[PDB]
């Protein structure tokens with residue numbers, strides 16, 4: 065039973081040993097490898113990385129935010145998670161040309177593409193009922209009616225909506241697989257920072273997978289995490305090596321409390337992470 | 346230095362070792378796995394599988410057909426290739442509620458998504474100029490003006506059009522990467538028939554890289570093939586055991602003899618494969 069988090073570190077161990085310098089948008093350098101993959105068992109465990117703390121409240125409150133279909137940052141900020149706010153800020157908007165938008169309007173980001181892929185996006189307050197493809201609900205329905213399906217895919221990459229978004233999607237598309245009553249989910253991340261984001265992402269889709277599994281009566285199977293530009297900031301190479309020598313502690317467990325039957329019904333108070341003991345720093 | 350095809354074979358084996366039983370949309374039953382990723386170097390060699398020749402006339406002629414934006418199966422038919430005409434016969438079209446459609450009208454498939462993502466669809470023979478998002482050119486433009494971009498993506502998976510298609514895209518999305526003046530490409534393939542498809546698209550996208558490289562002046566790097574539901578059809582199990590023994594012969598080499606600018610200008614005669622000595626047919 066080799067710890068799952070070992071697959072993760074292995075990727076860093078690998079980016080170091082084999083990666084090369086590639087500068088990002090702001091000119092800042094990174095060491096990176098293009099195209100990677102990792103698999104995580106969702107069976108009785110829950111891949112909430114222990115070799116460093118993962119902002120789980122952010123993972124959970126944001127996912128719940130994505131499900132509502134919200135695109136208004138303040139609506140997220142409200143619950144304590146302040147990570148999108150910087151994109152829905154006044155100045156940031158006026159700068160991308162969205163001077164006409166009210167503060168908080170991120171555009172057709174994850175939420176929108178998730179529940180209304182295709183609908184003409186108007187404001188962060190337009191009513192979108194019945195408009196655009198509701199991928200989330202559709203993935204769910206498919207899993208129930210036709211679990212063998214090889215097309216249970218949710219996709220946030222809307223070439224059309226791109227120039228209207230606060231920033232491109234990172235988790236472009238995810239695929240759901242069902243076999244032997246187990247539900248798996250692969251996620252394609254175009255770009256991920258192995259150090260800060262990825263651990264969060266691994267958590268998000270693991271959470272999401274636990275959810276749909278619950279709603280449909282399946283046992284969480286595996287979580288395949290696939291990347292495009294997996295990278296690390298050169299200015300972090302040290303903080304990271306000090307981490308690779310760290311030994312992974314057994315992955316906590318996610319336990320859903322009440323029996324939720326609809327995905328929109330899930331509330332924060334329904335999840336409990338137990339046994340999460342990560343290495344401080 | 347390990348030989349390239351070892352990848353694809355090693356996957357055939359693993360799908361045999363662990364490939365769990367799972368049926369398709371015809372109950373044909375298969376040995377399936379979910380979440381795989383192979384890496385193929387495109388440096389000086391071309392990955393055209395040798396333990397079983399690959400219909401190159403198709404790989405090349407179809408990709409060209411894609412680039413054209415042609416959603417007519419006869420168009421790819423006239424060129425001496427018939428693999429997308431079955432889906433355009435007649436009983437088939439009506440078989441999906443598509444009666445009003447001409448003979449050979451495939452719907453918003455690949456080509457249309459590559460050159461007109463988002464453009465309201467009509468019929469195989471109508472003009473979509475200045476319509477949609479011309480991802481393909483947009484990708485190349487970007488490869489040239491910003492090789493660092495972590496969002497160089499072409500997506501054929503459109504939830505809105507998915508209903509008007511014959512078969513939904515197996516080539517969900519692909520991502521291009523540049524570094525050290527090298528162009529790499531990762532393709533996300535949702536489902537894949539290991540013994541009759543996988544080889545065909547590996548090359549198909551490898552070819553695509555080589556083309557874009559030639560017009561962007563970058564040199565081919567590696568093609569990353571990521572799979573979702575990677576399967577082996579039950580019957581295919583025996584032939585694959587004997588094809589699985591055939592020892593791999595050196596990858597051929599693709600030579601773009603002529604020299605072109607735009608991508609809408611390549612032609613079947615502009616390519617050559619040498620060193621391609623396939624195993625007995």
Ligand SMILES: N[C@@H](CCC(=O)N[C@@H](CS)C(=O)NCC(=O)O)C(=O)O
Nearest residue numbers: 089234255256257260261264265495
């Ligand atoms: N937007 C950057 C990439 C930024 C990136 O990968 N950020 C990580 C955080 S360090 C992320 O977006 N994570 C999103 C999530 O975990 O949901 C680019 O493509 O140039």
